[PDB]
Paper text:
Rishirilides are a group of PKS II secondary metabolites produced by Streptomyces bottropensis Gö C4/4. For this purpose, excision of rslC3 gene using the markerless time-saving CRISPR-Cas9 system, inactivation of rslO4 gene using Redirect® technology, and crystallization of RslO4 and RslO1 proteins were carried out.
The monooxygenase RslO4 crystallizes as a homodimer and the overall structure of each subunit is made up of three α-helices (α1–α3) and four β-strands (β1–β4) with a ferredoxin-like fold. The three α-helices are located on one side of the homodimer. Together with an additional β-strand of the other subunit, a five-stranded antiparallel β-sheet, which is stabilized by ten main-chain hydrogen bonds between β2 and β4 of two chains. The closest structural homologue is SnoaB from S. nogalater, with a sequence identity of 41%. Closer inspection of the active site of RslO4 revealed high similarity between the positioning of Asn7, Asn52 and Trp56, which are represented by Asn18, Asn63 and Trp67 in SnoaB coordinating oxidized dithranol by hydrogen bonds. The high similarity of RslO4 in the sequence and three-dimensional structure with the monooxygenase SnoaB suggests that RslO4 mediates a mono-oxygenation in rishirilide biosynthetic pathway. Unlike SnoaB which oxygenates the middle non-aromatic ring of 12-deoxynogalonic acid during nogalomycin biosynthesis, RslO4 might oxygenate the third lateral aromatic ring in its tricyclic aromatic substrate to form a quinonic product. According to the observation from molecular dynamics simulations, Trp56 contributes in the orientation of substrate positioning inside RslO4 pocket through an H-Bonding network with the three –OH groups, which in turn leads to an electron delocalization in the third aromatic ring. The results of dynamic simulations match those of the Site-Directed Mutagenesis which demonstrated the importance of Asn7, Asn52, Trp56, Tyr22, and Met29 in the catalytic mechanism of RslO4.
Numbering used by the authors:
A (entry chain B): 2 to 112
B (entry chain A): 2 to 107
Write the structure that this text describes.
Amino acid sequence: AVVFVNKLTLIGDAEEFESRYEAVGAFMETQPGLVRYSLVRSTKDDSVYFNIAEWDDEDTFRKALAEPEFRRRLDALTGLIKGEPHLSLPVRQGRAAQVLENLYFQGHHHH
Amino acid sequence: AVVFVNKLTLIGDAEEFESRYEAVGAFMETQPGLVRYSLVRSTKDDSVYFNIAEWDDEDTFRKALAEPEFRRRLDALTGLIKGEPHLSLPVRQGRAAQVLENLYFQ
């Protein structure tokens, strides 16, 4: 898996930016290789967002990025945000299933 | 849910940073409210990492950070990285959908 992380700086209207991002996320949802994505907004500095997307691999991320209609919805955000994008590799991970498993094992093993 | 994002800049040895971060990840996994976390390293600028940690709510995140053991293991990263921390609220999210989803008319 690869994890796309874009640190966004809001330079326009927050509500307009977020509604337009909706169409980007909608499109990503049936792009091959997309696992999940989240747009999150900092509570410390509300001009700071992060676009975070997990992809099966680098090749599927590459092929999705090139799709004209995806790029059209992405381009509709230019002028509302500036981006500092990072295609990134997982280095250490606490998977949800494993976090849950360690909890219920400690509680139900009765060591 | 809330998503903590820390943009980390490496200022020492990457291998030791990553080994010492193992202890931080381990302790997080024992704390009430943790959903999941990933530490990822940028392939554009390899001095950049992001810690991305998902918690049930701000409350559980704040309560975990009040643990002395958590603070001890964070303090062991001093000199290896610098942080830009952001507790963040999900604004939009989704996951892989079925291409045929709308053709059931359910």
